[PDB]
Amino acid sequence: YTPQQRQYLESFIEKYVDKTKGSKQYTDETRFAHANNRNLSSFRSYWKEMVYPIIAERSDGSRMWDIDGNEYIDITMGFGVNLFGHHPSFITQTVVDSTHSALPPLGPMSNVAGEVADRIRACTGVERVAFYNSGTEAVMVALRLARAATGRTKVVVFAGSYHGTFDGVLGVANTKGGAEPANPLAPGIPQSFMNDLIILHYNHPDSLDVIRNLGNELAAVLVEPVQSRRPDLQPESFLKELRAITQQSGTALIMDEIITGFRIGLGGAQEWFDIQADLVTYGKIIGGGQPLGIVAGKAEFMNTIDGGTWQYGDDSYPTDEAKRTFVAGTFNTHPLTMRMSLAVLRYLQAEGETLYERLNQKTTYLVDQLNSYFEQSQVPIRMVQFGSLFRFVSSVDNDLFFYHLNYKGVYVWEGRNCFLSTAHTSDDIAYIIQAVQETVKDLRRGGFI
């Protein structure tokens, strides 16, 4: 560093830590008893005096407060969960109605689950819908069904994608590339789990030309339609060639709409692109803040959860039993979760396509303005967008950038997927843009461009 950068930092770290000395102690007091991989977030040794996450205390709409009192405008929003802001109207009415009503328990099946399923079909045009407890868990079911129906084993995922924390998708592509199998992403993930895994560059036509050369050997091909990491990239022609090649080869197309489902537009990325996959997995938003994973899609694949549907009065039976796999789970169809998932759908289905339209425009307000600021100031940053999911792209040292954003009361988190919601007022939208520009000026005066 120059003498200028060192004394900017050795001075900002001072102002930051004093603003967040609540979270610093609480992370420091609880770091051992609470094992969380988020405590090491953005760890460099020369600013170690400010590496702790923000311990939040309250939230309401688009405002989140920490235990220091500080107020944040939230572009984190539960990693994608709170499309309607924190504690919206209909949601706590559901939560407040649970106290008044002697809710039913786990154990017996759910009287609400049938409705939640029909409305998901309504909004997305899938045939059958199951319920599990995380996106991780839903993705892991999805692979099992597709593997259970095709009776094959090898599956393809694309680098860049995220898909939960199920061991069978935690790979990196092969040293040899091509169609050769994946190697583990980290310690403790055994190679044996990677052998039925194949990884290919997404938006690389060479790889559509290897899904063909596997052709019949492929159980399923898992795709993050738009990748959380790279919202700007939304390849309609890649996916659609992929749809042709999988339906041609009898291979499952699995679409991961845990982030885009119910975000870009009611029908998810299925409605956007107008592509209908074999299996689609949903998460985050659809639980209304209760934990929730869902795997839905075509009956011809979904029939592996219960062997096939039947009716009363005749001699009919589940014809696919020789193909039904094993799926279980204690908190599946949770009573309160299944009811908040109703609130969300009944609200979303009422307020029309103009709930999404209004929110995509104001997210595009943000992306468009912030980028014009970046251009007429030659400042080397860019906003990328898909729906109300935006991110920052920048050769400028990222972690130091988002430290200022956090300082200035805009709570972005460590993955940096920032989201708007329908809770973000014009005050709020402007306050983000002011916080970005205050930052570029703070940071350029300190000589960091």
Add this chain to the structure above:
Amino acid sequence: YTPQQRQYLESFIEKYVDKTKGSKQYTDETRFAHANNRNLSSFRSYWKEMVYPIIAERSDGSRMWDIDGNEYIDITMGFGVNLFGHHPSFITQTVVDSTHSALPPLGPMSNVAGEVADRIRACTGVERVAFYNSGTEAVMVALRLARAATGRTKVVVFAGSYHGTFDGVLGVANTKGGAEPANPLAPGIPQSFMNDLIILHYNHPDSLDVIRNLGNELAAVLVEPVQSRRPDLQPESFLKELRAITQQSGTALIMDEIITGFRIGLGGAQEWFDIQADLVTYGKIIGGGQPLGIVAGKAEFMNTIDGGTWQYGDDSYPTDEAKRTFVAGTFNTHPLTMRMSLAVLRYLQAEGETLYERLNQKTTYLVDQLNSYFEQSQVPIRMVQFGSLFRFVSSVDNDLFFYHLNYKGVYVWEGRNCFLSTAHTSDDIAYIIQAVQETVKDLRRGGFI
């Protein structure tokens, strides 16, 4: 079925469908939309016309009600989740505050999961606590950490144990037994996920030696202390010797305590057998009715989550970070869940050991009293137990038996793990005994003895 029994049955189906007709109709109107492996339970094409799960509607204390408006005395207690009965004082209270006290949001770290970590430490002896979304998720991560801390791949699980839905534990015996790699449990669970599994007889004393062979090749032996399926089996000699071996072989001793943890006693299976595992999973009860799944244990293994600890002020940094592996989770340390987990913990440490001493012996009363009825009347049914988990071992058609238990107003799910709660009264114990005794009387009268 003899000409006799065959007509008893047809009187039973009729009397049974009429009582639970709404659960029939709901289940049909939603079998397609809502895929759920549970809709197939106890399916036999002849008594087909009563093969539907019970759909609940409301509950409190120890009773559930179905949508046909039948009452039942719940002995399923939500698969063992509700130690405390349904909607206890403190759990529902904590809900009301969640609506009036403006919860923090997902995203920023929890300001409560530290006390829940501290509280768990007091109750179990675990060194470090980490929080996920399902018992399933907990086992999946626990193995990963084990495989990462030890740099080994191979894992032993025990036949008869249940450890959730991760594909890494969903295997069965290689017919040529021994220390051989296993076979899948269902179509679509890919054999590659069986390459590093090894499945040995629990309490076969040879299997104690197969672990001493693999000595350094085992990353972990995964043991459900008291197998849910076989509660009568409480093999302290075997486990103590399983501890000694794995310790000297530096192999992780994960103890799946999702059902045993906080049920047999506060320390759970660990406390009971006076054995400190390396890794212990927890779930079910410790969610206070919310979903939850925990992995806790010795830092020699937990440090693979963040990479080890370090302080503020001094030039420290994470040490075990070499062994740092991949974990995450959208719904981890959920603001409600953590508060109910806190709620449940506080409540537990308030009531003495008196709480458990009674629930186990209020069970014993039911267990013993019933076994004696069975010895007098020469009925081929015997009760088994571990604390407040109990089962019916019997040579009568079980499926016909529980239909009698269910129609008679005692709710028992398809998996037949039964638990009693603190909410059951003596009048409830009597009522269960009666409904059993008159089921024997009913089964006798029909010629099924």
